[PDB]
């Protein structure tokens, strides 16, 4: 019945495990040894730092859809690449440009010679977030073997007027821009 | 406007017939007709028979592929003797193939491979179907006596109106009417070769149904009793043998009183018995395969 906006992107638990007591070893007295450990329940010492408890976003990692005919689509750290097929050729760059013109995004740089462009800012009206993200993106098309391929990269992401560089957010809103591009290309076709 | 280069003309058991095959045999039969003086019918009636021959060829080729039968290069070398008619015209190169396909090598070599593979698998299956009985051999040999009785040699043209192995009476009367109409046309003055190209399920339809010169005893019997009473050019009405209705025309005949002087007659009688058995079992098995096989003509 009753619900809260944050039931999404949250762990289905009480977060009590963060209060568990730390593990400490036992000292072996002189003249004897402690029984040899099995090593079945050993916890490796990982020095990584990351979100814990409610601060960890468990939303599935947004993978590029690759709607327009293609394969070996990928999502890098801050950039995303989609490989296309079916004889697009140089005509890929016009279509890409037209697609991003259909979104009336604020394109700031337009270098047709290098098949590159850059926008100022776009916003996302997501019902999933308590605060709406926004990011600055650069898109390009480059030749690969037989055909051209599109790439979309994020300059930075911002929340509430301050920057954010979380890997999950970067991946999510690059798959967002990549899906936008792929859907536009498919619609054009 | 876009131009169609090739397409699938027929779908068979996991195979396809391409339009580059129908056209090839179309040109082949047209060239043979022109050299033989025998006029041939309209595009569609000729097309249906060519498509049927290609369905039967694709079925047999897939059976050969399934059964692990392959052909050697020396087999192609030997077929060059007769398939290319090098013995008749002394030249090896493909410049003799002036009619069509620009004197290409691979196309005609693959065509020959297609014929050798079909013939090989046909022969193997039909031979494995033959049953020979000593009693029949003795009977036929004792028939081969009294100055080689029935030494008549015949060149005949044959037309087959097919019926399924288990036909319905409706189909029976339909085939009966068709066969009687063809027989009436042939007897009234219609050229049997033209009738054969238009109306025939036999493999030899594309060649006009000519069986070539043979000896009467070689007939499966279904034709010899009726055929003993017939002159050059006569038309023989419909008959049956399991595969459908049969119609025969006596193209030519030649008889002589030669006698081979049993020690050497038993082997010859076995040869002719094997010839008749192969002809009948071949027709029966090719009809069975046609009924069984999956096919969907495409248009």
């Amino acid at each position: 019945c009753s619900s809260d906006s944050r039931y999404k992107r949250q762990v289905s638990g009480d977060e009590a495990y963060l209060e568990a007591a730390p593990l400490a070893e036992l000292h072996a007295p002189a003249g004897m040894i402690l029984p040899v450990t099995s090593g079945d329940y050993a916890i490796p010492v990982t020095n990584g730092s990351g979100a814990v408890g409610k601060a960890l976003d468990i939303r599935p990692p947004a993978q590029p859809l690759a709607l327009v005919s293609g394969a070996r689509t990928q999502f890098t750290g801050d950039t995303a690449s989609l490989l296309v097929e079916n004889g697009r050729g140089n005509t890929l760059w016009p279509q890409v440009v037209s697609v991003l013109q259909a979104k009336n995004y604020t394109i700031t740089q337009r270098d047709d010679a290098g098949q590159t462009l850059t926008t100022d800012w776009v916003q996302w009206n997501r019902l999933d977030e308590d605060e709406q993200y926004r990011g600055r993106y650069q898109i390009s098309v480059k030749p690969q073997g037989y055909q051209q391929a599109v790439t979309v990269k994020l300059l930075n992401l911002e929340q509430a007027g301050k920057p954010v560089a979380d890997a999950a957010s970067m991946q999510r809103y690059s798959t967002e821009m990549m899906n936008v591009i792929s859907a536009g290309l498919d619609k054009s076709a | 406007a876009p131009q169609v280069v090739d397409k699938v003309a027929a779908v068979v058991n996991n195979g396809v017939v391409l339009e580059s095959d129908v056209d090839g045999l179309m040109q082949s039969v047209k060239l043979n007709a022109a050299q033989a003086r025998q006029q041939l019918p309209d595009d569609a009636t000729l097309r249906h028979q060519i498509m049927e021959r290609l369905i039967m060829d694709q079925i047999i080729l897939q059976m050969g592929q399934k059964m692990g039968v392959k052909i050697s290069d020396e087999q192609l070398d030997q077929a060059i003797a007769n398939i290319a008619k090098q013995n008749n015209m002394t030249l090896d190169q493909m410049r003799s193939r002036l009619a069509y396909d620009g004197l290409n090598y691979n196309t005609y070599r693959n065509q020959i491979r297609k014929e050798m593979i079909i013939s090989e698998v046909r022969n193997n299956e039909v031979r494995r179907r033959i049953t020979i009985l000593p009693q029949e051999v003795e009977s036929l040999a004792q028939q081969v006596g009294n100055q080689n009785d029935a030494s008549t040699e015949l060149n005949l043209s044959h037309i087959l109106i097919p019926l399924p192995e288990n036909p319905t009476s409706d189909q029976v009367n339909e085939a009966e009417s068709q066969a009687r109409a063809i027989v009436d046309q042939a007897r009234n003055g219609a050229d049997f070769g033209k009738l054969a190209i238009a109306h025939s399920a036999d493999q030899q339809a594309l060649n006009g149904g000519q069986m070539g010169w043979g000896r009467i005893q070689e007939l499966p019997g279904i034709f010899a009793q009726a055929l003993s009473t017939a002159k050059k050019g006569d038309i023989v009405g419909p008959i049956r043998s399991g595969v459908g209705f049969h119609i025969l025309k006596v193209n030519d005949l030649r008889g002589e009183s030669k006698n081979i002087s049993d020690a050497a007659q038993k082997d010859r009688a076995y040869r002719m018995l094997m010839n008749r058995k192969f002809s009948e079992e071949a027709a029966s098995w090719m009809q069975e395969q046609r009924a069984s096989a999956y096919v969907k003509i495409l248009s």
Binding site: - | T131, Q135, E165, G242
Partner: protein, 371 residues
Amino acid sequence: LFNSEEDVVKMSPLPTVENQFTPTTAWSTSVGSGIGNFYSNLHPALADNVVYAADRAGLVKALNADDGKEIWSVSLAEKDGWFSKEPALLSGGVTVSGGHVYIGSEKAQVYALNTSDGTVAWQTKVAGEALSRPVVSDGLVLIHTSNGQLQALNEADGAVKWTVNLDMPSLSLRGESAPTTAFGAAVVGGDNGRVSAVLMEQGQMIWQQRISQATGSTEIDRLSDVDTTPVVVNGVVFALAYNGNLTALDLRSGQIMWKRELGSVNDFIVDGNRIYLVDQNDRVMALTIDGGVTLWTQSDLLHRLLTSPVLYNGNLVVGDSEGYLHWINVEDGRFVAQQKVDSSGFQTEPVAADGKLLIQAKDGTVYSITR
């Protein structure tokens, strides 16, 4: 539970015919309870103008052919009361030869009643249910039990002269093939689909040859039973298998001469240069003997479970599961006449001999048909 949930509508309707003559029932006589709903081979036997009939429990009865009047009756159901009154489960059909009346039984018994009054001359235990029709020849009585064993009882005293084993599949059709006399041999069928020939002296197998295509996936598609009687003519054996081929074989060599996708479990007829047949679907057909070419076919009775045909007065006669007798012209499938004889169905083969046609209904009533 529910009696209104299971039914398949695959029965042809009663054809309309203009009868060229008026079929008549010369006489009729009740013989016990009859075959009943069980599938059996029991049928009358005609011998010297005497009609011998039997019953599933056993009521062996002898009736006059002329007016169905009886001359002697007996019951083989626990005559001495060894255990209550158990049924004899007779299912061998009446055989008549040499003054003896041979009958099989599903209790693995073979009775050899007498002609003069019915006294049981001898009773022999056999390898199993004597489903086959006894065949009398060369002083021997051949039986083919349900467990796949051909036995040759001695005619005089019933002693088993010899025995032969035949392979039995995991599933088959109820019934067994009756051997044929041939020339000092015995040509028999089998549930495995292999026709066999055995010499009359002992069980030395002469030849065996497969008759069924049996290209199925599961057991029900491999039903290759040869439950018909092989017919020997001029040294060629005609055999017919269920879901198999109507084939002709050399009597001694055993190699097939020709084959045709036609199956049945009802005995066929070989007359002159023609073969009259009834397929498993109740399709009356006529072929030729030299080669299979279906001279004509009839389908008006399709899926009306028919009995085996009999040649009578120059025309073919067949009974049906509803008690209607149908006459068919030999030259063509046109019906020559039709009659209603009994309310209970006709299952077992009719008898046509000495210019007289007899049949027995499922209820045991023996009918004589004339004109």
